[PDB]
């Protein structure tokens, strides 16, 4: 029971989901106030930053848009 | 945290806030999918329907509005 | 094309919807930036106050909760 | 005024805004309820599909991410 994040695979053109635990570890930041937040993925190192809305890999620099789902409100049945 | 949630009191003419553990069981609810969630409050049992915004009286069918207030919205 | 705000009515226990001049009224004053907007409906005066989202009978100063709908982001097929 | 569309440059690593028409298009269809949008830009022809919240060039196929960010909610 959190937001689903997202970042977008320029490769499959589509947006992703993260990891139960990547995606715990960013609502807790995002809930918390945090402007970043760092987990791993691949093995590779990621900071997410919500000023610009991005994941940065750390070793390479390269910036890829991540996004916050709304849900509806009403909610449907 | 959590997101805020506010039922509306026609008594007072304002919007209250919740118990902050009352709170937590209706947004890990609304989190989950859920489309209602069921406690208590004033040692009085609720229903708040997703579907309409409602919380309902158990005991009586009586309907007081709700409200999701987000804590924060991605910006530039 | 604008929001849909709706009032609370107490008596059927349901959020009901404003006429289109008044949802469109409503809506501008909102996307202005305004923290309050009046019209009429039912041949009665009414304040719509942001700050409190409710509405206010001018004459008799009875206050009804207002809500914003809130559209799901992705949009569902 | 109207809501803020952007979509994503992998060039610049970016997310810029449309022009002022562009994002009225847009805005105007996601509150009809429309599932997608067609207009130009750089003299290009591109589709938004809000259902996948993306950008096709319309030649290509080629598809670059959008989002919507909201210039105000409720508080309090
Ligand atoms: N959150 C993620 N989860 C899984 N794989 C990811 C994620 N972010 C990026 N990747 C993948 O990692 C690979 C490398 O991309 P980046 O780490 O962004 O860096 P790079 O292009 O190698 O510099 C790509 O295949 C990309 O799809
Ligand atoms: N979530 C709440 N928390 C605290 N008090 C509440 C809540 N909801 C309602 N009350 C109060 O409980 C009283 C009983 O009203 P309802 O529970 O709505 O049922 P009713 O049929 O009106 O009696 C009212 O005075 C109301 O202000
Ligand atoms: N936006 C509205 N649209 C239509 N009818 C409304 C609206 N707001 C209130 N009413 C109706 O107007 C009547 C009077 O309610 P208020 O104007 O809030 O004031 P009052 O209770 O008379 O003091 C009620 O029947 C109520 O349902
Ligand atoms: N909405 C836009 N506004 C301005 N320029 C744009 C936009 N979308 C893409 N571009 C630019 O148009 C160029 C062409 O890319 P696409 O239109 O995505 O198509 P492609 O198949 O990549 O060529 C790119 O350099 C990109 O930066």
Same mark, same amino acid.
Request: charged letters at 20%.
């Given at each position: 029971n959190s937001n689903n &994040? $997202? &970042?977008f695979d320029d490769r499959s053109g589509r947006w992703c989901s993260? /990891?139960?635990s990547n995606n715990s570890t960013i609502d /807790?930041?995002?809930k918390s106030? %945090?402007?970043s937040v760092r987990f791993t993925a691949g093995r590779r190192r990621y900071t997410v930053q919500? !000023? !610009?809305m991005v994941q940065? @890999? %750390?070793e390479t620099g390269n910036r890829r848009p991540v996004m916050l789902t709304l849900l509806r409100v009403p $909610?449907? @049945?």
């Open positions: &994040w $997202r &970042w993260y /990891s139960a /807790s930041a995002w106030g %945090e402007t919500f !000023t !610009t940065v @890999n %750390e $909610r449907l @049945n």
